[PDB]
């Protein structure tokens, strides 16, 4: 488990992530755009950069009871996606690392 | 210098707390609320001791650190104050700043209260202890501080932002008065060359509150890693020819230029958001004392336009005595 | 009347949480922080809930109860506010004020935050339901409520003190204007006629904190039974020739005068600022100023009073 | 409030201290408990109430917490037969009466 | 009586001092710091004097004369103060507050530092000589002092405004204590009868700083000449018809509306602070206060004589 | 106060610049002698003494400055002749009447 | 290093002037006024401009001047400002905080008005110009400012001291808050690195005063030549056996205690200096505003109590007008 | 003209300049001591050393008219004075350097 396609490519999610302020629902985007949708909806501070904590946010996130995942899978977990796609060693994700995979 | 950012040692909002109430890779133990936007460290109360520390020991040979707080409080003089910590131990109760005494590492105190009497205070102090001396506290650890600015970071408009780095044996600490919203405004404060610690240590964060009550916020504690330019290994041939990166950064842009479009024209078709400016927020403690002043005022009036109807009532009606009469 | 202090329902400073760490003979929950000097029902972070509620329940006919408390903002508005219920069973959750709705008694909600847009608030409003009435957050409880007055309560130099009084089936609701550290300086504010509450009831507290931030402190509970002239017993024959009595006040009188003579002396066996004074002299100034106003108000309705007994013959 | 409880020395000793320390352990049975009275008012109003005796019997000075009936039980048992006046407080003239 | 401004005796702002560096009419001396908003006649410094004296002699047999001033010290007390003198010759310098004595003439005295060690200063003290009577400076001339008052004018928020007016035999004090901007919200001080001075005589103004420093200025000096109502002529058609007056005025206020209308929009055409603003809420709510005191006041006195009518009946 | 003085447009036309300015080179000799009697006005009171004509007639637009004697004169020369109800002000009664 | 005192480049108390009115060594231009115990260089008027300039060239390779200096204002914001410059030509006239634009050497600027509306003021600002780059008063020269550092030097309860250090092509300035009366608490403010300035020049301290007003005192201005501990010859056998300098040393001693005891039992004798606390010539401003709102009040009860007393003959006589009748 | 003996033995120069806070006059006083009072008497920064700027403030001077010295003068004065008196180069003068001449 981890940054899977499916997870990101879960076009309902990303629909209940944007309402309130994108309140423009349609079932027909691409498998593309809503990955961009995804970074940018997970990027709180603004800097256009996906660091862990945000990560973590995403992974472990509230949507309704659900069990919470132990520290030590959260941190086996983003240290495996760092570990494979932090290229410049930044501890940041940028856009095309996180298209790469 | 090359910087790395370490989510094992920070927290950030606005999603500081989990839904079980604990901060992610940290432990936070005494008065300590830790909330979604900030964790309160210290409230506004009496005798109130609490501190948030790293569950898991860091082992950098170069950091950098970036605190963002606010210590706000009523009156004019505040206490204790907020401390810094890069220890050897988790001493998460004490009664230094929150923190045990007696601790093997570095120390940034920053002390709202002049208990020396000797008018130096708010002040940020530099404290370095292998672990044997203890905090003076009834003279604010001036016989022992390593170094020591004078500024003031209670009640101003935006959160006072610190950097702590330590980078060749030598540690720096910079401020941010808090007057500019901006986050890149450092000046300097203080340094002291061929300081040494721990090679691994505890990251912390905690205050105190004694007679006197502040409210000690914190809001971020971002922690880098910090690598010299040349000792970095640079491990080529990793970019993937470096063209997918230009052939989606514009396509990052355009996205960015769309949403803020589609943001900007769905923001005003249903208003419901009431807002909340930094300027309604913010104000001066001794123009809050001004203000107040009017106020009291503004009753006195009252009681006196009451009475003169009063007074009016005793030139007419007396009049309708008189004429009759 | 006649006013019967209760300790089973109040709880004050400055040993308000005993060694355990809670409040005697008080259930509280939520976000409510109790310490030695007060309890801070709602601190200064967003969407904070907190409510203080008796143990046991209370069977007064007629009662009492004065609350001291501070509601303090770094801003200009404030949300939400304060809330004094006597219930009949404890809520200690939900989304009014802090505590649960359809509640089956009387609540006093001192409402910071105008959600109906009127610039009415801050304001003190009393509310009363059966259990089958919701409030209406929305703007206030505008239409449900029974009574109200427009008065500020927010960032004063010394603590709000409030006097809720239900004594012969009407409600008083008497408001300090936090401007002196009198204790008995109240000022009307509300009251409501024929109001009917169970007997049977738990008194309690709350506060909640919206968008905007408050701390909402309550410092004081003190619950009184008030009982008529009329109907209380005399029981006579208890006073033991009330002579003890007389003889015993002096001597106490004495002795406490010697106390302090010791301490004058004994403070300085082995040992305010500028500002602060000029402000804590600017407020006694203004409180002057409001006394003598007042007097002469008084002196001139006796004028008045004496000038209507000379003309009516 | 048995008599006991109130005629020790040590205690008013090691209570009045910080202001007042005037060391002699000859004090009278109306003396000590004159102090008592005085030192329990924390409100300075010259009365005894319920919350001042009830924080009174418990203190800080280990031992587990009494339980919250039996405190009930024994301070209405207190205010039952030292209240004359009903009047919801204990005054010195009901202290020393009984 | 009837005023006629005088321009030979005065400065006022805001073009005070002249191209060459010297204020119009007038000869100053000493310390004096002229500048174009005001006069410092005494600065901020360890044993300063200054003076402002009249060039051309005054010739009036009543007059009266507006000084508006500042007297500013960083600690409570200052040193040594100002003096407005009348006299027959312009001293020029002196050790009496800056100027010569054994003056013959009228000098009005606002004395900040207490040489007697009674507590009474700062006053205003006025001492008139014929040129044969030494000022007594170690005690604030109480002995030779005619009149005296004992009000404040140091660090007011506003400048104060003194009214100095001599008019038959009789020389009359009026001081603003300076808490308010109205041009006319003068306060009784002092007055004498049967003073003589000289017809003949040169105005001036002085300061004087001894250990301790204030700032002496003087914002403006207006001098009016006060003439009887029946004695002076009346001198008649000279009005010329009085009806272009009339239909001159309100095409002036119609011209000035309309260039207050278009400085309105371009003053936008190409483009106060919180606590400064709070302050002055405070000093307006105050005058407010007194002034709607003083209008009970004088309701109660027209009851008083209404009510002395009606029992004279 | 001589005719030339006031009826000469590039004075005020230099003189009101900076808050207000609507150049038009039409203006009656009403007109600029509105202006000038409006800006002269320094103290805002709608009158004019002896003061204001000093530092106008003198200003700072080089020149030596002119004499005492001889400034006391044309002032008074000025005065004499225009004031009517002897105040010691010059009102626009006055000065549109000479 | 190694400090000597140069009198030709300094000026202090309590003889400031001389009895022709000219500060020694020192030429004063614009609006100075020059007196016995401080040099007032721009007072508190609008649009004031002073300087003091030194008469003579001074060539030193490494220096230390130490100011003492008041700015006084009534108002929260003060204006224009401070200014200590080492120049090659004087700068009596000018724009530039009372002095002319365009100088060779350095400037150390203490800045009280915020021109560019950053909340970045008051601040210290050390500008070198070669002598082609104009100050750029509307953004208070923060484009070409070499350093900065933010402290507050207006309304002090002590004169405030600055050092500036000019050692090894390093300008360092130590700015002493003014807090304490202490004359060695200095704290480090900024430093600028290989910075070059002419060898020989002028030293000069000018004020400006600009819409607000400020009362710009300089009470004292010490110019230390620094010499290298390598390069400064010893001289040697020039002590004459140092014998004396111990034999003379407790006679001063035993003079002073003489003095000192002499002064002691002769100050009671005859009791006649008033004094002068620093108490009673310190206030802050804030509660300055606050205490002339006490003094409104004490007009207002007058005006009551007067009115409380007519009311009380309306009590009085009226009832002598009603039994008798 | 300069530092020269008789100035500094001036016993009337010396009485009248201690006056107001030392009313002891008395015309029996050593050669010696004279001069200790004339060093304390003219440090007024209280620093126990004499510079430059209180000696050219002695050398010039007040007592009542008399002309005054030229600038270039007392700099001669002054810096003959501190050339051939300062032995350490530290610009202040000790009291054994004032008395050693
Ligand atoms: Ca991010
Ligand atoms: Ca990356
Ligand atoms: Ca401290
Ligand atoms: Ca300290
Ligand atoms: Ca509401
Ligand atoms: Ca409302
Ligand atoms: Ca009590
Ligand atoms: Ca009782
Ligand atoms: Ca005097
Ligand atoms: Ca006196
Ligand atoms: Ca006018
Ligand atoms: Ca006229
Ligand atoms: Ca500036
Ligand atoms: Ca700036
Ligand atoms: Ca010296
Ligand atoms: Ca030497
Ligand atoms: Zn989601
Ligand atoms: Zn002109
Ligand atoms: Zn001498």
Avoid at chain 1, 3 to 27: F, R, S
Avoid at chain 2, 291 to 312: A, P, S, T
Wanted: glycine content about 8%; some cysteine.
């Amino acid at each position: 488990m981890g940054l899977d396609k499916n997870t990101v490519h879960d076009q309902e999610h990303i629909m209940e992530h944007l309402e309130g302020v994108i309140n423009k629902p349609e079932a027909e985007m691409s498998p593309q755009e809503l990955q961009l949708h995804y970074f940018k909806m997970h990027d709180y501070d603004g800097n256009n950069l996906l660091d862990g904590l945000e990560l973590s946010t995403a992974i472990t996130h509230v949507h309704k009871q659900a069990p919470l995942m132990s520290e030590d899978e959260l941190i086996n977990i983003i240290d495996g996606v760092l570990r494979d796609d932090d290229k410049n060693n930044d501890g940041y994700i940028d856009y095309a690392e996180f298209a790469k995979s | 210098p090359h910087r790395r950012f370490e989510y094992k040692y920070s927290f950030k909002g606005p999603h500081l707390v989990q839904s079980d109430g604990t901060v992610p890779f940290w432990a936070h133990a005494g008065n300590a609320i830790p909330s979604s936007d900030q964790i309160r460290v210290a409230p506004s109360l009496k005798s109130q001791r609490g501190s948030v520390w790293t569950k898991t020991k860091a082992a950098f040979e170069n950091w950098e650190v970036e605190v963002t707080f606010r210590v706000t409080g009523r009156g004019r003089i505040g206490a204790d104050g907020l401390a810094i910590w890069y220890a050897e131990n988790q001493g998460l109760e004490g009664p230094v700043f929150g923190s045990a005494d007696l601790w093997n590492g570095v120390g940034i105190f920053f002390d709202s209260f002049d208990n020396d009497g000797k008018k130096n205070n708010p002040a940020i102090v530099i404290i370095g202890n292998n672990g044997q001396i203890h905090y003076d506290h009834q003279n604010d650890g001036a016989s022992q501080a390593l170094a020591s600015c004078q500024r003031d970071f209670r009640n101003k408009p935006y959160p006072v932002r610190a950097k702590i780095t330590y980078y060749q044996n030598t540690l720096t600490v910079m401020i941010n008065n808090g007057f500019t919203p901006d986050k890149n405004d450092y000046e300097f404060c203080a340094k002291v060359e061929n300081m040494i610690i721990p090679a691994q240590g505890h990251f912390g964060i905690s205050a105190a509150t004694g007679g006197l009550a502040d409210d000690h916020d914190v809001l971020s504690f971002l922690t880098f890693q910090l690598t010299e330019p040349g000792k970095e290994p640079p491990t080529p041939d990793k970019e993937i020819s470096e063209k997918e990166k230009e052939k989606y950064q514009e396509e990052f842009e355009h996205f960015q230029q769309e949403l803020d479009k589609k943001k900007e024209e769905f923001q005003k078709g249903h208003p419901d958001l009431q807002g909340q400016p930094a300027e309604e927020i913010f104000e001066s403690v001794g123009d809050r004392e001004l203000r107040q002043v009017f106020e009291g005022q503004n009753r006195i009036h009252l009681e006196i336009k009451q009475l003169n109807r009063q007074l009016d009532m005793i030139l007419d009606e007396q009049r309708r005595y008189v004429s009759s009469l």
